[PDB]
């Protein structure tokens, strides 16, 4: 695999988004994986509802967190809508997914990357954009502004984010809390430090979309 991963560079990232208060993170996370292995597959990049994950994946809780992996199985299951039918609304409402039409895009499964494994995660990120989860409650993560990101920080893994590229001693993240924070959405996190839980315990539970 090679040394520099950019999915952004290749036209399968959207526009940074922000959740707002709501602990939505896991949708947002699901959808970016989502958006990016459409765009591998089909040749199109489109914006697809987190709201929709958020109302109908009844094995989350709505905005009082959930899993990226339950999402990812939803959209396996039945699919997802593009995000102008079900926009995004910062609160669980009901799961209106049979009112809005046809589903817009479909996959076909949901794979875990093997934890605890750096370079497991660089070989799924080479192939598609990974959901990815860490540990943000520090201040250090909360108020980073930018560079390559050692911390400090525990293990105490707490929000879903997605792993879309990498580098030399980095892994390249999109964050769902606007485009003012990090580098412009984004934060580059260190790798390669010999601890496995990864910096943040950012190798701790990954996954990932397929589509046939
Ligand atoms: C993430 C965020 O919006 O910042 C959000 O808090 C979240 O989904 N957290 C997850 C954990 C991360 C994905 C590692 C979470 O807590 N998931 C478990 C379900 C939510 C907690 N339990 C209940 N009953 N609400």
Redesign the pocket.
């Known amino acids: 695999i090679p040394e520099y991963v950019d999915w952004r560079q290749k036209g399968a990232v959207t526009p940074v988004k922000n ?1 707002g208060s ?5 949708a947002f996370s699901a959808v970016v994986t989502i958006e990016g292995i459409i765009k591998i597959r089909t040749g199109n990049l489109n914006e697809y509802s987190e709201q929709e994950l958020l109302d109908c994946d009844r094995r ?2 709505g905005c ?5 992996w339950s999402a990812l199985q939803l959209v396996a299951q039945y699919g997802i809508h593009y995000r102008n039918t079900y926009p995004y609304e910062g609160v669980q409402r009901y799961c209106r997914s049979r009112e809005k039409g046809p589903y817009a895009a479909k996959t076909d499964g949901v794979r875990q990357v093997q934890p605890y494994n750096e370079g497991a995660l660089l070989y799924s990120i080479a192939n598609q954009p990974v959901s990815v ?1 860490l540990e ?1 409650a520090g201040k250090d993560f909360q108020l980073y502004r930018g560079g390559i990101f050692v911390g400090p920080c525990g293990n105490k ?4 984010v997605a792993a879309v590229g990498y580098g030399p001693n980095y892994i390249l993240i999109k964050n769902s809390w606007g485009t003012g924070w990090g580098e412009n959405g984004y934060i580059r996190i260190k790798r390669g430090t010999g601890n496995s839980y990864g910096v943040c315990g950012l190798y701790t ?1 990954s996954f990932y979309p397929v589509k046939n």
Not at 22 to 26: D, N
Not at 64 to 68: D, L, S, V
Not at 157 to 160: G, I, K, N, R, S
């Open positions: 959740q709501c602990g939505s993170c896991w989350s809780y009082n967190g959930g899993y990226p989860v943000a893994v707490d929000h879903a539970s």
